[PDB]
Structures are given as C-alpha cells and as structure tokens.
Amino acid sequence: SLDFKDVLLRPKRSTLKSRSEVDLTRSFSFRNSKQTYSGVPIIAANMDTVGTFEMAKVLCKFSLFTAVHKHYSLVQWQEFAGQNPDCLEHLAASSGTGSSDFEQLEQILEAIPQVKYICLDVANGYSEHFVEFVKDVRKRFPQHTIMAGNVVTGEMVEELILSGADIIKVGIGPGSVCTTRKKTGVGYPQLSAVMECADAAHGLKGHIISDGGCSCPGDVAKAFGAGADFVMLGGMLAGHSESGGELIERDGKKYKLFYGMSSEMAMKKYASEGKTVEVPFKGDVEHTIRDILGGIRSTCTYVGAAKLKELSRRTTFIRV
Amino acid sequence: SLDFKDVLLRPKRSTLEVDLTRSFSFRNSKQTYSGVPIIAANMDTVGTFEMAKVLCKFSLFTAVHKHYSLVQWQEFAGQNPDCLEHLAASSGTGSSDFEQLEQILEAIPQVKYICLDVANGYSEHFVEFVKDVRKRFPQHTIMAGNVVTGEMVEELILSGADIIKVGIGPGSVCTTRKKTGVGYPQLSAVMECADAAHGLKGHIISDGGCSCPGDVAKAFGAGADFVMLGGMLAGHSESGGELIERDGKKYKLFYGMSSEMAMKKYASEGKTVEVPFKGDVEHTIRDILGGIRSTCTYVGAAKLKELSRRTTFIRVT
Amino acid sequence: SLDFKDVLLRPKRSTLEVDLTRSFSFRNSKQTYSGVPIIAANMDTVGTFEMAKVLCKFSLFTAVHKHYSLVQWQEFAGQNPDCLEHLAASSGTGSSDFEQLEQILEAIPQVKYICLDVANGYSEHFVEFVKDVRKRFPQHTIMAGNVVTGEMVEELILSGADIIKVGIGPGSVCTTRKKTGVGYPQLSAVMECADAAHGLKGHIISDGGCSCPGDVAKAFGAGADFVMLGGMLAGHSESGGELIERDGKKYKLFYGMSSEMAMKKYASEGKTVEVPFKGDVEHTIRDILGGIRSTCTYVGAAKLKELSRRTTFIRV
Amino acid sequence: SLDFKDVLLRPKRSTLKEVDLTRSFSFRNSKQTYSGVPIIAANMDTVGTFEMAKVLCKFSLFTAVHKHYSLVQWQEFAGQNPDCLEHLAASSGTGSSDFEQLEQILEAIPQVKYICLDVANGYSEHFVEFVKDVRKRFPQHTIMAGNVVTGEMVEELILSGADIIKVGIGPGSVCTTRKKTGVGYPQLSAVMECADAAHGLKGHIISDGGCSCPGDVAKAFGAGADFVMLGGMLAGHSESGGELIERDGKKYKLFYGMSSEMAMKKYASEGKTVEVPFKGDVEHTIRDILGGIRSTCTYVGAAKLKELSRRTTFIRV
Ligand SMILES: O=c1[nH]cnc2c1ncn2[C@@H]1O[C@H](COP(=O)(O)O)[C@@H](O)[C@H]1O
Ligand SMILES: O=c1[nH]cnc2c1ncn2[C@@H]1O[C@H](COP(=O)(O)O)[C@@H](O)[C@H]1O
Ligand SMILES: O=c1[nH]cnc2c1ncn2[C@@H]1O[C@H](COP(=O)(O)O)[C@@H](O)[C@H]1O
Ligand SMILES: O=c1[nH]cnc2c1ncn2[C@@H]1O[C@H](COP(=O)(O)O)[C@@H](O)[C@H]1O
C-alpha cells in the first residue's frame, strides 16, 4: 500500500553522455482508436481553474497536453481554434455522462475536427452506467482517442479498455482539493493504484493516466517510474497567471482560488467531495513546467534512462 | 491494531437513492427497529430533546442524557409524540440513576429503549446491573456499554443486553488513554465485537472516535449495526453547551461526562473544548448521510445492510 | 522496541478503593518497605525538602537532591521527623560525593535509603563505587543507576545494589540521545530489566519519560517496582527552579542535571525549559494516583501488586 | 531502510578508567598516510572556507575547501598558514574549467595532497573515467570521489583510482534532490552497505550529509564510516561564509545548496536556501560535537574512535 511519500528511486549505473541527452517525449499507438501520439505525456487537468485555453497555449510550446474543462461555450472554442491552430493536437474535450455534457462535447468535436481526444470523467468509474456511456462514445467517435475514469483497480481498468476507452484515468481521493476520503472513506494509495492499473492496462496494449496526488516533480517521476503512461496535474498548475481562479489581493499578498469540481464553490458557480483553497500566486506557468521537466530529466539521468520510455524499466523503489 | 485512519474502502463494480434504513430484531427484548442507525450520544451537550426533534425528521436515534427532570420528559413527550419511538432513556448503575430511569419508563410507556452506560463495562457490578434491568423491563431494548472485546460483549448479551456499546478511550473529549493508559483501537474493537455480537444474533454500537462521515462509513463497513456520535453533533443550535462569543467569533462548550466541568455541574477522564459554532444540525445530518450514501454507491451497496458485506479495507500509511 | 506511546492496556473482567501500597523486602540490605512506590527524582528542582513534606502525606518517596548542606539536612530532619522513612540521600561517584553522603547518613540515622546515580551505570568505576557504598552501609537500601539492559542490572545487584534505576535518554530534559546517539526505548528497557532484577529477587525503578499518569501505569504494568518522576513534578510551588513572571504568565525553570545551567550553577547532556507554573503539588499527586487506581480498576487489580500480573499490552 | 533517526546505540560494560578520536588511515591507491580526527568541513562555499580551515586544524579536523577561491587567495592562505595544508583538500567537479582551476592550485601549492572530486551523480560512466584520469594525472594525491549510495558503485570508483568514496544522495540539510527527482537512499543504510564494500577493497568512505546533531555523527562512525562530512552543522558561524543578516532584532547567516538558484546565480535546481540563526565562533560547536562523540565511545566501551563500529549495536526505535 504505497503512496508517493513511501518511496525513493534507486540511482543506477549509467552510460549516458549528459542530462541534455534525455528525451521526455513518448510515442504511443492507442489500442481502440488506432491513433498515434507523440509528446511529453504530462496533462493539465480538466478542472476549470487548470484546463484553460491560456494554459494550453503555454503548455503546447513544451509539447505538453491539456484536458480542457467543460465550461467553455462553443463560440469560445471556435475563437481559440481560429487563433491557435497549432494548439489543437495535444488537446482534449471533456464530458461527464449528462445528455447536456454529451451534446456540448459533440458540437465541439463536429465544429473542430482537429480535436482528436476525448476525456470522459466521473468520480466513480466503477458504475455500469459509465461503462455503457464509454461504449456509446466509442461507437459515435471511432477515430477519437478516449481517456476515461476514474478507477484504482485492474479489473475496472480491463473492462473500460474492452468497452472502448484507450487511456484509463487512475485515482480516487488522492487529489489536493479532493475530500472523497474524509466524506466517504473510499480510495486507494496512488502509487499502488498506478502499479496495478499500469500492469492491467499494458496487458491489453492500453494506457493509463496517474491522475492526482502529485505535489512536486519527484512525485511525477515516481508515477512514471511506477508505469504510468501519462501523469495528470491539478494543484501543481493552479495559481499561475494562466490558471483560472479569481485573483485575490488581500493583506498585501496575492492568491488564486483553486477548488474541486465537486466542491460547493464549483456547484454554486455552475453533497460535496471537494473543497476550496487559496493558493499563493505563482506567476507564469512556464517556470513551473521547466522545473517539472528538469526534475524528471535528472531522475532519468540518475537511473540511467536515456528516454522517458526507459524510466519504469530502470526503476527500483526503495521503501522509506 | 486499527483505527479509522488506518484504512480506506476499496471501490467496487456496481450496477446501481441508496437506502440507509435498517431493520433489526433484537435477541433478548424481541422488539424490532426500523430507522437510520446513527445515534446522538447521551452526553448532556448532545442527547438533548432539541437534538431529538431534528434527528427524528431524518429517522435518526437519540440516546437522551440523564439530566432532565421527569416533568421535562413528560412535557417533551406530550408535545412530541412521534419522537418517542427512536429515543432511549439513559442510566448509570447508581440507585438514584435507576430510580430516575424507572420513573421515566413508567410515566412514558412510548420509550422502549434503555441506554445503560458506564466507563468500565467489564465490572461484575455492571453485569449484575444489566441482569436486574432485564428482569425489571423484559420488553425494553437494552443498550449496554462500554467494552472493547468479544468475551465481554458475549457476557453482556447473555446477561440480557440487546445492543453492546463499543469504545473505551476513542472519544473526542475523552482522556482515559492519557489518564490510565487503557483502551483499544476503535476499528479493531468494532470488527472483533461485531463478530462476537453477531454470533449470538445480538448487535453493537460503535461509540466514539468519528470525526467525519468517512469514519462513520468505516464503522458501518466493519460491521457496526449502529454508530454513536458526540463531537460531530456538538456545537449546533440544538446542542447544549454555553454559547460564548469572544474575539468576534462564536463557540459552544463541549466536554466529557467525566470531565471536571461535568462533575462540578452535577478523578477525571474527560476534557473541555470550545467548538466553533456550527448552526443548525440539519445541515450536518445531510452532510453525514450524503457521505455514507456515496460510500454505498462506491462499493455497489444498494442499501446500508449490504455495506459490511461489500467492504474490503485497504491498509494505508 | 517499545516506548510508552506505543501501547495501551487492555481492560479485563473484574470483581472488585484500590490499594496503591506495595510491600518489598530488599535483596541485599534485607530491609523492608511499605509505601506508594512513586519517587520524586533527585534533580535539584524536584527532590526538594518541600516536595518531601507533601509527598510523605500520600506515602510517596523522595530521592533528595545532592546540593543541600548538612546543616540544611539537620534542620529539615529536626523540624520534620515524620518525613524521613521514605527519603533517600543521593550521591554521584568520587571522593567528595561519598564524603558528603557519609556525613548526612551519620548525622541523620533515620535516613535508610541511598540513591547512587550516574549517567552511565555500565562503567567498572561505578560498579566498584556501588561495592564500597554497600560495604560501608550494609543495612542501608541502595538505589543505583542508570542502565537499560539485563546483564548490567544483574551485575549491579550482585555488586550490592538493591534497586536498579532504569533509563538512559528518556528524560523530558535529557539530550543524551541527540548528543551521543545512545539510549534504549523505555518500556522495553523496563520489561527486560524487571525480569533480570526479579530473577535475582531484586527491584527496579523506571526512571524517566513519564509525562502523564497513563505512562506511570504502563511502567508499573511492565513490571517496574517503582516509578521515578522529574518533569511531572517540576513547576509546582514545592519544586525548585526560579519562578519567572513574564509576559503576564508564571513559569518555573526546569533543567537537566548535566545541562550547562546546572554545571554553571555548581560536555552537556541536558537542557533547560520553562514550565508553566502548576501550583501546589498535592493536586498533581492526586491526579496521578487517581489515574493509576482507575487503570487497576479497568484491568481488575485490587492492589498495585496485581497490575503487572493483569497487564496485557496492545500495540497502537 | 535506515536513517539516523531510526536507531540508537546500545550502551555496554566498560573498563575505561579521555577517548582518543584520532584515526590513522593508509589509503589504497595513493599509498599516502593520514592521521587526524576524521570529520570534514564540506566543500560548500559557506562551509569549506579558509577561516574554517584555520580553526578546524587546531582540533585536527579536515577541510574540503570550496571551488570559488582565486589562485592568489590560495597562495596567500598557504604562505600565511603553512600548518593547515596537511588537512585539506582542493575540490573540483567534472567540468573542464573546474579541473583546470584545480590543476593550477595543485601546481602552486605542492603541500595540498588531497583532491575532492564531487558531483551530484557519481553513477555516470563519465564520472568513472574522470576519476581514472585524475588518478593517472595525480598518482600520489589522495582522491575523494562521490557521491554514491550503493556498494557496486563504491567498488567501481575504488577500482578506478579513488581512495575515499563520498556517500550520500539526498540527505543534505539544504538538498532538494528527493523532492525534485524522487531519487535517494536512507543514509544510515547507505553508510553500512558502502562501508562494507569499501573496506573489502581496503578503501574508505565519507558519510556525506544528513547529520544535524553529534549523535548523528556518532551513528555514522558506528555504522563504519571512516570520515563524516558536515555542511549544516558548521554553517552559520563567524568562520562560515554566507551573508550576515541582522533583521527583526536577530542575526542570521545564509546557507544554501551548491545547486540552489542562489548558488547558480552567484557563479534546474536541486538545493535550497535557508537563513540560519547566527551561532558565533565555530570552536564551541567543534568542542560540542567532539564531546558528544567521546561520550558515545564511553557509553559503548571504546577507548578509541577506531573501536566504535566494532562496539556498536544498533537498536531500532
Ligand atoms: O471535487 C473534487 N473531488 C475529488 N477529486 C477532484 C475534485 N476535483 C478535481 N479532482 C481530482 O483531482 C485531480 C487533481 O489532483 P491534484 O493534482 O492533486 O490537484 C483532478 O484531475 C481530478 O481527478
Ligand atoms: O468524559 C468522558 N471521558 C471519556 N469518554 C467520554 C466522556 N464523555 C463521553 N465520552 C464518550 O465519547 C463518546 C463520544 O465520542 P465522540 O463522537 O468521538 O466525541 C460518548 O458517546 C462516550 O462513549
Ligand atoms: O541532564 C540530564 N541528562 C539526561 N537525563 C537527565 C538529566 N537530568 C536528569 N535526568 C534524568 O531524567 C529523569 C527524569 O525524567 P523525566 O520524568 O522525564 O523528566 C531523572 O530521574 C534523571 O534520570
Ligand atoms: O544543492 C545541493 N543539493 C543537494 N545536496 C547538496 C547541495 N549542496 C550541498 N549538498 C550536499 O549536502 C552536504 C552537506 O549536508 P548537511 O551536513 O546535511 O548540510 C554536502 O556535503 C553535499 O553533499
């Protein structure tokens, strides 16, 4: 039963030249969509304060991915797509299982053919209703790569991949502004979740996202080390200029709101399993991305992985 | 050796409103119960008639504290005939306590539950008290505690108790563990005592140590039939404890029944805290029930009766 | 590797006021004891004459600190003849300490207990000192320490000590552990050493690390014959240490006997704290005994002698 | 997986009757001989100073001098302080510029007979080959090389020419390696493993980082470290570098990681900056560390530091 804080990665003998030699790009072929991916497999979360068009514009420059939140209008999308044609390939449109959610998703995907990824997102990915929903989206968009979640165990990973999802989002309760564990007692240690879900998905030639619980670049590296194909970040990317969330200047300091998508704040804006925080303002996100990628490059260097693809193979966890 | 904090519930494949009601048939009293098996503690700041009136609307249970007068009881009962079915009158082992109790149960036949409550449920003296109350009130359902191990749960049920209160030292204003070194991790206590009670077709209350709706779910998931709450229900309009406005903030006193504050009022194993004021308890009750419904949904339980069967605990650091 | 915080006592079925008195017969001095076997530590802020006067009224014991003149002792004895039966005169090693001790014992024959106390009870030098004291005072009961393991308990008892003082590094104002890395978890120390002592019909004092009555209970439950308290008795009226009123609050100094503060007063392995003022020690003694009585009640012990017998520890 | 906090040393019977903290070593590859008290001031720019070297020499301690002195500053120091040169190392990373600077120092100051080759990652084949090259170039100088945390790499570095292997990745007080990269190793375990590896080849190790009190230094020696290197414990003194800052009525000194942004700016981060309350003259700190370790030796029955690891039994806490 391992969380990120329970482990370190062992350094290992390497034959690398320097650490500039390290390639964080991955190449993936998705099981069901048959589509191909090339990029740095870190994803801005589809939270309304994180998965913003402003976030996507910066992250595109580092070949990072954005799961866009589900509170932009079609006109907002078409304006963005018009102005930022070269930002559309590492971008996903998001939906819950609502008929209204699905409608809106369908209009974006019709209006903006360059968007080739769908993020289907529920708190409880273990319901039959979500499984059937994944199957239907798969029937409606056979060439769109589907991310689906969330779950924390292998049986549910297999079933979602066999139902038509390409990439399974892994994490229940680990998120920085999540209160699922306190309100319900349900969840799963994230690193253990990733290890189990990674094996289960890879057995079927599918993929996973480690979604939530990362608070430093070291955690991101551990999740990749444990076999995650992608890592999704909320709190690390909140509080930047490009982030959503109200700017609040009080008592001589600057803060940004950050809140869970099932917080009372979110539910009012548009039973609670999320909370609100005020994050000290962080400035521009590009400095944060550079820190994250630098940290992972060094991890690779320490374990002798010349490419991120080699990281999980070269990873031996030490229990602390 | 587990506390609530040592575990998470594993989510499970479901095919599914969750029904949080339970139906019980009590081994010794032979009476039946239907309701939401969450109980307001018989603390003087929690088990109040004002608490009872709201909890009734949600079909929750109130163990009333032992510091109301007969006139006060008679008053409440005459104006609130429909709260009476999910109410227990409480007593310690005292002569005076038993007398107060008897007067209440005589004058208010609608009260069909008795909460017999001492800090140390392991004393022969307490065992003999339970027997005496079972003789006196053959048709009343008896809750009796507290204990933390199976052999004592067995002994108490065979002595006539229907429902055993489980917990020594986990409570939010309890100081037993610091004062005496005595106690038992609550989750382990519940698991063990639940197996013991259920072997005799009896029942248990997880009494103490819940500070969030997830804890309540873990107690139920571990096999508790009922969960008893003090701290989570303290601090509301309906709660007792003086309202204190200081430094532009509002607080409510909450204190252990063996605290120096309680003893003065009416050797210490309880403390006093000031709780920031919480407003109406109704909103807390919804938050709790909403939490537990979601637990049920996550593990594929259509009703609370299924939760323990569908619970697989995951050990967390 | 257990500390007090690592365990709880399991309650047990009972058929029961609890007697906190114990009777002991000492292996080497051949003397007998009846009393409540909680001891005030021989720290200059705790093992005071004022502390002894209160503790006597509850039949508790006082290991007097080693920084009173003989004239001070003579005056206390003259004025307080009934407070002398549960008192020890304390000493470190070396000529001057031995000489002081002798003078006190000679002047005040009612003092029948000797507390021999060094940081490291594992040295040959200490063993030989225990031997000398025993030979000089063959009817005095000897407390000697400190140690944490069974081989050393045995050697000290065979060298002539009656009661072995157990604990290295657990004290609230001790810094041995940070300074030297040396020590031993106190509860495991107690269990091990008690078995060693009791095999020779000797006795132990659990010395250090109790910060609440539950801790005292655990120490006895693990088989400690006596429990010695410093920090729990510091900060009272009867305690030494300067009363300091500052920022509208009252504090008392409390400090390790190897703190720079102590060394200066008369290589540090102790520290200084300021303890909020606690008032009269009487109320604290009652809270302590009240808590231990309730432990006995929870486990079915009618007498303190029955507590280790009826103790089952739960790892928490 | 052990850290210094996870253990205590068991006391033991002794017949001692002051403890000698001097050691003598004969180095595997350089064939040179050492005698002194084997505690080393780290080669951080705030710790490995000429002013530090001057005080530490009085106690027979060792200084790994930082990389940011000029050639004239070295030559001035050596001219004015001929008696300090026996117990210092000149330092270098693997960059062309570092190594050149070092060559110039060794050419100017023939009394400097120790070299400290110091990278964050001693596991690279690039570092291994650089060690071989420095050994070829300076066959009579004693070479300290690191950092690593496992035996295979200790052996390889020793076989490649290094005399003394610097052990520790991530434990340092102002290191952020573990947060930025997830990479590391518990320091006590690293020391035990690496000491065994080194000693089997007749080499030696330095436990580098993670000591915050004398007890930690004693534990590292007790685990088999030949030397212990200190950054944090020596920061914040008069003799230390770092700016003296008087603010809010108090005195502080900067202390920062050599891969911190502060250090990089000054001359992708894996170190941080702190302000350490000013400690005064380092001599009193040195007396406290030595007194602590002498006292550990006394408790375990070691007349001499050379006997400590042999008399050490760790108890897990
Ligand atoms: O209200 C919520 N409740 C529980 N989890 C949430 C909520 N909102 C967002 N999350 C999850 O937390 C993730 C971000 O985790 P973080 O990086 O630790 O902040 C998102 O990708 C979601 O999966
Ligand atoms: O004074 C006391 N000392 C120890 N436990 C107490 C005291 N008063 C009430 N309790 C217990 O604590 C429970 C409430 O626990 P809570 O929900 O954690 O606050 C009550 O139902 C009692 O079993
Ligand atoms: O300076 C010292 N260093 C280490 N231990 C000390 C020192 N002074 C007193 N002690 C011990 O601490 C014990 C009291 O511990 P306490 O009850 O935890 O405060 C005394 O009985 C001594 O054994
Ligand atoms: O920027 C840094 N990042 C990581 N480790 C560092 C850095 N700077 C110095 N160190 C290490 O930390 C050691 C000192 O550790 P300390 O004694 O715990 O302060 C040095 O000898 C280096 O090995």
CSV table of N, CA, C and O in Angstrom, one decimal, chain B residues 33-86:
chain,number,residue,atom,x,y,z
B,33,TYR,N,-36.8,-2.9,15.1
B,33,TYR,CA,-36.4,-1.5,14.9
B,33,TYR,C,-36.3,-1.3,13.4
B,33,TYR,O,-35.9,-2.2,12.7
B,34,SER,N,-36.8,-0.1,13.0
B,34,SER,CA,-36.6,0.3,11.6
B,34,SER,C,-36.2,1.8,11.7
B,34,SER,O,-36.9,2.6,12.2
B,35,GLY,N,-35.0,2.1,11.1
B,35,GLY,CA,-34.6,3.5,11.1
B,35,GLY,C,-33.2,3.7,10.5
B,35,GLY,O,-32.6,2.7,10.2
B,36,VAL,N,-32.6,4.9,10.5
B,36,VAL,CA,-31.2,5.1,10.2
B,36,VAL,C,-30.4,5.0,11.5
B,36,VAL,O,-30.6,5.9,12.4
B,37,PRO,N,-29.6,4.0,11.6
B,37,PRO,CA,-28.9,3.5,12.8
B,37,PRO,C,-27.7,4.4,13.2
B,37,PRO,O,-26.6,3.9,13.5
B,38,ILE,N,-27.9,5.7,13.3
B,38,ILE,CA,-26.9,6.6,13.8
B,38,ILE,C,-27.6,7.3,15.0
B,38,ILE,O,-28.7,7.7,14.9
B,39,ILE,N,-26.8,7.3,16.1
B,39,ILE,CA,-27.4,7.7,17.4
B,39,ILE,C,-26.6,8.9,18.0
B,39,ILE,O,-25.4,9.0,18.0
B,40,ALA,N,-27.4,9.9,18.4
B,40,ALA,CA,-26.9,11.0,19.2
B,40,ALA,C,-26.4,10.5,20.6
B,40,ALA,O,-27.2,9.9,21.3
B,41,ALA,N,-25.2,10.8,20.9
B,41,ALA,CA,-24.7,10.3,22.2
B,41,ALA,C,-25.5,10.9,23.4
B,41,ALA,O,-26.0,12.1,23.4
B,42,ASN,N,-25.6,10.1,24.4
B,42,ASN,CA,-26.2,10.5,25.7
B,42,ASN,C,-25.4,11.5,26.5
B,42,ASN,O,-25.5,11.6,27.7
B,43,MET,N,-24.6,12.3,25.8
B,43,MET,CA,-23.9,13.4,26.5
B,43,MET,C,-24.8,14.6,26.7
B,43,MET,O,-25.8,14.7,26.0
B,44,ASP,N,-24.6,15.4,27.8
B,44,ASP,CA,-25.5,16.4,28.1
B,44,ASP,C,-25.6,17.6,27.1
B,44,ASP,O,-26.5,18.3,27.0
B,45,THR,N,-24.5,17.7,26.3
B,45,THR,CA,-24.4,18.7,25.2
B,45,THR,C,-24.9,18.1,23.9
B,45,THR,O,-24.9,18.9,22.9
B,46,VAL,N,-25.4,16.9,23.8
B,46,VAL,CA,-25.7,16.2,22.5
B,46,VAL,C,-27.0,15.6,22.5
B,46,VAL,O,-27.9,15.8,21.6
B,47,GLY,N,-27.3,14.7,23.5
B,47,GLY,CA,-28.5,14.0,23.6
B,47,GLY,C,-29.7,14.8,24.2
B,47,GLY,O,-30.2,14.4,25.2
B,48,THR,N,-30.0,15.9,23.5
B,48,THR,CA,-31.0,16.8,24.0
B,48,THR,C,-32.2,16.6,23.3
B,48,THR,O,-32.2,16.0,22.2
B,49,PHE,N,-33.3,17.1,23.8
B,49,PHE,CA,-34.6,17.0,23.2
B,49,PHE,C,-34.7,17.8,21.9
B,49,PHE,O,-35.3,17.4,20.9
B,50,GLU,N,-34.0,18.9,21.8
B,50,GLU,CA,-33.9,19.7,20.6
B,50,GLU,C,-33.2,18.9,19.5
B,50,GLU,O,-33.6,18.9,18.4
B,51,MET,N,-32.1,18.2,19.9
B,51,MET,CA,-31.4,17.3,19.0
B,51,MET,C,-32.3,16.3,18.5
B,51,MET,O,-32.4,16.0,17.3
B,52,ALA,N,-33.1,15.7,19.4
B,52,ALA,CA,-34.0,14.6,19.1
B,52,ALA,C,-35.1,15.0,18.0
B,52,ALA,O,-35.3,14.3,17.1
B,53,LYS,N,-35.7,16.2,18.2
B,53,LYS,CA,-36.7,16.7,17.3
B,53,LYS,C,-36.2,16.8,15.9
B,53,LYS,O,-37.0,16.6,15.0
B,54,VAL,N,-35.0,17.1,15.6
B,54,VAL,CA,-34.5,17.3,14.3
B,54,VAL,C,-34.1,15.9,13.7
B,54,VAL,O,-34.5,15.6,12.6
B,55,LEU,N,-33.4,15.1,14.6
B,55,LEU,CA,-33.0,13.8,14.2
B,55,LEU,C,-34.1,12.9,13.8
B,55,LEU,O,-34.0,12.0,12.9
B,56,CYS,N,-35.3,13.0,14.5
B,56,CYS,CA,-36.5,12.3,14.1
B,56,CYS,C,-37.0,12.5,12.7
B,56,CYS,O,-37.5,11.6,12.1
B,57,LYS,N,-36.8,13.7,12.2
B,57,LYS,CA,-37.2,14.0,10.8
B,57,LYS,C,-36.4,13.3,9.8
B,57,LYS,O,-36.9,13.0,8.7
B,58,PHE,N,-35.2,12.9,10.2
B,58,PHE,CA,-34.3,12.0,9.3
B,58,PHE,C,-34.3,10.5,9.7
B,58,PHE,O,-33.5,9.7,9.2
B,59,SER,N,-35.2,10.2,10.7
B,59,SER,CA,-35.2,8.8,11.3
B,59,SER,C,-34.0,8.4,12.0
B,59,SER,O,-33.6,7.2,12.1
B,60,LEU,N,-33.3,9.4,12.6
B,60,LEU,CA,-32.1,9.0,13.4
B,60,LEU,C,-32.5,8.9,14.8
B,60,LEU,O,-33.6,9.4,15.2
B,61,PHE,N,-31.7,8.3,15.6
B,61,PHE,CA,-31.9,7.9,17.0
B,61,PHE,C,-31.1,8.8,18.0
B,61,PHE,O,-30.0,9.3,17.7
B,62,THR,N,-31.7,9.1,19.2
B,62,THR,CA,-31.2,9.9,20.2
B,62,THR,C,-31.2,9.1,21.5
B,62,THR,O,-32.3,8.7,22.0
B,63,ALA,N,-30.0,8.9,22.1
B,63,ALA,CA,-29.9,8.4,23.5
B,63,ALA,C,-29.9,9.7,24.3
B,63,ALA,O,-29.0,10.5,24.3
B,64,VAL,N,-31.0,9.9,25.0
B,64,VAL,CA,-31.2,11.2,25.8
B,64,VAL,C,-30.3,11.1,27.1
B,64,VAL,O,-30.1,10.1,27.7
B,65,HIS,N,-29.7,12.3,27.4
B,65,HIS,CA,-28.9,12.4,28.6
B,65,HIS,C,-29.7,12.3,29.9
B,65,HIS,O,-30.9,12.4,29.9
B,66,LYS,N,-29.0,12.1,31.0
B,66,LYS,CA,-29.7,11.7,32.2
B,66,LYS,C,-29.9,12.9,33.2
B,66,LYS,O,-30.0,12.7,34.4
B,67,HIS,N,-30.0,14.1,32.7
B,67,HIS,CA,-30.1,15.3,33.5
B,67,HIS,C,-31.3,16.1,33.1
B,67,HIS,O,-31.3,17.4,33.3
B,68,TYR,N,-32.4,15.5,32.6
B,68,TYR,CA,-33.7,16.1,32.5
B,68,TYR,C,-34.5,15.6,33.6
B,68,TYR,O,-34.4,14.5,34.1
B,69,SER,N,-35.5,16.4,34.1
B,69,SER,CA,-36.4,16.1,35.1
B,69,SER,C,-37.6,15.3,34.5
B,69,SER,O,-37.8,15.3,33.3
B,70,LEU,N,-38.3,14.6,35.4
B,70,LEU,CA,-39.5,13.8,34.9
B,70,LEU,C,-40.5,14.8,34.2
B,70,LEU,O,-41.0,14.5,33.2
B,71,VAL,N,-40.7,16.0,34.9
B,71,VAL,CA,-41.6,17.0,34.3
B,71,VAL,C,-41.2,17.4,32.9
B,71,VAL,O,-42.0,17.5,32.0
B,72,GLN,N,-39.9,17.7,32.8
B,72,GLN,CA,-39.3,18.0,31.5
B,72,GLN,C,-39.6,16.8,30.4
B,72,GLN,O,-40.0,17.1,29.3
B,73,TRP,N,-39.4,15.6,30.8
B,73,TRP,CA,-39.7,14.4,30.0
B,73,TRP,C,-41.1,14.4,29.6
B,73,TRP,O,-41.5,14.2,28.4
B,74,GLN,N,-42.0,14.5,30.6
B,74,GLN,CA,-43.4,14.5,30.3
B,74,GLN,C,-43.9,15.6,29.4
B,74,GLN,O,-44.9,15.4,28.6
B,75,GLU,N,-43.2,16.7,29.5
B,75,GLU,CA,-43.5,17.9,28.7
B,75,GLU,C,-43.2,17.6,27.3
B,75,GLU,O,-44.0,17.8,26.4
B,76,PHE,N,-41.9,17.2,27.0
B,76,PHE,CA,-41.5,16.8,25.7
B,76,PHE,C,-42.3,15.8,25.0
B,76,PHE,O,-42.7,15.8,23.8
B,77,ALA,N,-42.7,14.7,25.8
B,77,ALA,CA,-43.4,13.6,25.2
B,77,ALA,C,-44.8,14.0,24.8
B,77,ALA,O,-45.3,13.6,23.8
B,78,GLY,N,-45.5,14.8,25.6
B,78,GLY,CA,-46.8,15.3,25.3
B,78,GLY,C,-46.9,16.2,24.1
B,78,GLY,O,-48.0,16.2,23.4
B,79,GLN,N,-45.9,16.9,23.8
B,79,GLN,CA,-45.8,17.8,22.7
B,79,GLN,C,-45.1,17.1,21.5
B,79,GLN,O,-45.2,17.7,20.4
B,80,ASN,N,-44.4,16.0,21.7
B,80,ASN,CA,-43.7,15.4,20.5
B,80,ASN,C,-43.9,13.9,20.5
B,80,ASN,O,-43.0,13.1,20.6
B,81,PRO,N,-45.2,13.4,20.4
B,81,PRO,CA,-45.5,12.0,20.5
B,81,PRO,C,-44.7,11.2,19.4
B,81,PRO,O,-44.5,10.0,19.6
B,82,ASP,N,-44.3,11.8,18.3
B,82,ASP,CA,-43.7,11.0,17.2
B,82,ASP,C,-42.2,10.9,17.3
B,82,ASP,O,-41.6,10.3,16.5
B,83,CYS,N,-41.6,11.6,18.3
B,83,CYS,CA,-40.1,11.4,18.5
B,83,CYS,C,-39.8,10.2,19.4
B,83,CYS,O,-38.7,9.8,19.5
B,84,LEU,N,-40.9,9.7,20.1
B,84,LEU,CA,-40.7,8.8,21.2
B,84,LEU,C,-40.1,7.4,20.8
B,84,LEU,O,-39.5,6.8,21.6
B,85,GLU,N,-40.4,7.0,19.6
B,85,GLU,CA,-40.1,5.7,19.1
B,85,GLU,C,-38.6,5.5,18.8
B,85,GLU,O,-38.1,4.4,18.9
B,86,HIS,N,-37.9,6.6,18.5
B,86,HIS,CA,-36.4,6.5,18.4
B,86,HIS,C,-35.7,7.3,19.5
B,86,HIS,O,-34.8,8.1,19.2
